[PDB]
Every structure is written in C-alpha cells, then in structure tokens.
Design a protein around this ligand. Structure first.
Ligand SMILES: Nc1nc2sc(C(=O)NC3CCN(C[C@@](O)(Cn4cncn4)c4ccc(F)cc4F)CC3)cc2n(-c2ccc3c(c2)N(c2ccccc2)CCO3)c1=O
Length: 215
C-alpha cells in the first residue's frame, strides 16, 4: 500500500531521453499513438466481453476521452479498455516492449523517424515529444486501481491509487506538457490532430472542453 520505486531497463530509458530532447517538428503524432493504444485496449475488453458480456459491467461504455486541464498544463487520455494490472505497470513495459524498444533504437540509428515508433509496438513513449512527465492510471477488472509515474529518467514509481477519480475500468494517461507544447490543450488544436491522424477509430473519441459561461 506504498510507493514502489523501480528502474527502467536501459532500453526503455534510452528511448525516453531521445524523444524528450528531440527538437523534431510534427510532435503531434504522439496523439495518434496514444489513441491507437486506447483502441487496442478497447478491442481486448470488447473481445473478452463477446463470450462473457459481464466483464463490461465495471464500465458499460466503450469510449476514448481527451481531457485538457489548462490550469494544470495537463492533458489526459482516458479509455474504458481492458486496463493494466500492477503486474503490467511493471511487466507491460517488458517482453513485447523490451524487443520493440531495442530494435526501434537500432532503426533510429539507421535513419528511421519517430513517426515509425508505432510499427515497433512502443508508440506509448512518443508522449515525451510533448510531455516532460507522465502518470498512467489503470484499472483491470481483476485488480485495484494503480498509478504509474515517470519523468523520462531511469526511475519510475508505482503506487496504489487512493487519490484519483475511479476509472471503473481502463486506463488514463496524464501528460504534463512542456511549456512550448501547450497548444495541445486547445480544442481546435486537438480536433485538427485527431481528424488528421485518427480517422479510422471504431470508438467515439470524446473531447471534454471547459468554457466560461459568457455574458
Ligand atoms: N491506455 C492503455 N491501455 C492499455 S491495456 C494494455 C495490456 O497490454 N494488457 C491487458 C492486461 C492483461 N493482459 C494479459 C492477461 O490477459 C494475460 N493473462 C494472464 N492470465 C490469463 N490471461 C492478464 C490478465 C490478468 C492479469 F491479472 C494478468 C495478465 F497478464 C491482457 C490485457 C496495455 C495498454 N497501453 C499500453 C500500450 C503499449 C505500451 C504501453 C501501454 N506501455 C506501458 C505499459 C505500462 C505502463 C506504462 C507504459 C509501454 C510501451 O508499450 C495503454 O496506453
């Protein structure tokens, strides 16, 4: 019931420093990668639910939700997919992620762009193009809610979630944007990116916008 600190394998840590310092334009592709991961997670609970339709009871709705938090300079990406267990918060960044990270690093050395990260299965880490820090909140039907946190360094933490909204089921990525990357808190900006790169998504992409009620 405490804060469990871990170290990244050199491969994961290696990719994060590259992306976070990268001065590459076209930073906007991070959102395509995260939406694709959200859709994959929803595919899995929808598939699991096809036989046992009661795995959906923890959150009956299947959605992708984007929440700008302007005062916090935070952007949240939430899904009601299958979710990740505490085991996964420390054992979903390995195996498929161990291979995909190391081979992607070698492709980058050969000349590959960060736009290709997704075809190596590690598109998650493209968030560091725009964020210098991230928390990942997740809730799997067969486990409690947990929080994963990293600031692109070799160390990340995992903590039982006693402070965030209850997800019901699924995952929410909390991106702490950089000061030069705050454009991605704006409704018009998010619409453009989603419509350009995420046209073929089987689930509703909901955008939560906060607006002052005018005179
Ligand atoms: N929004 C996101 N949502 C989802 S859901 C998800 C996922 O992989 N799997 C769930 C969990 C359980 N598994 C296995 C199984 O069923 C197998 N089993 C054992 N027994 C019987 N069956 C099972 C069941 C119950 C159980 F207790 C244990 C188990 F193993 C299948 C369904 C990944 C993501 N990612 C994501 C995508 C790509 C990524 C990452 C994150 N990275 C990441 C990872 C962690 C933290 C930070 C970043 C990094 C780079 O790449 C999202 O962004």
């Amino acid at each position: 019931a405490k804060v469990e600190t871990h170290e990244f394998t050199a491969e994961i840590s290696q990719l994060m420093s590259l992306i976070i310092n990268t001065v590459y334009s076209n930073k906007e592709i991070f959102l395509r990668e995260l939406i694709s991961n959200a859709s994959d997670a929803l595919d899995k609970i929808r598939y699991q639910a096809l036989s046992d339709p009661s795995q959906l009871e923890s959150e009956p709705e299947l959605f992708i939700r984007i929440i700008p938090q302007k005062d916090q300079k935070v952007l949240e990406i939430r899904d009601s997919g299958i979710g990740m267990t505490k085991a996964d918060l420390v054992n979903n960044l390995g195996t498929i992620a161990k291979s995909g990270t190391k081979s992607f690093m070698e492709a980058l050395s050969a000349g590959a762009d960060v736009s290709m990260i997704g075809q190596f299965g590690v598109g998650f880490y493209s968030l560091f193009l725009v964020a210098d820090h991230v928390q990942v909140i997740s809730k799997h039907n067969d486990d409690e809610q947990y929080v994963w946190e990293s600031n692109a360094g070799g160390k990340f933490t995992v903590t039982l979630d006693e402070t965030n909204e209850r997800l019901g089921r699924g995952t929410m990525l909390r991106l702490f944007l950089k000061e030069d990357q705050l454009e991605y808190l704006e409704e018009k900006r998010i619409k453009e990116v989603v419509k350009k790169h995420s046209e073929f998504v089987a689930y509703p992409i909901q955008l939560v916008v906060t607006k002052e009620v005018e005179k």
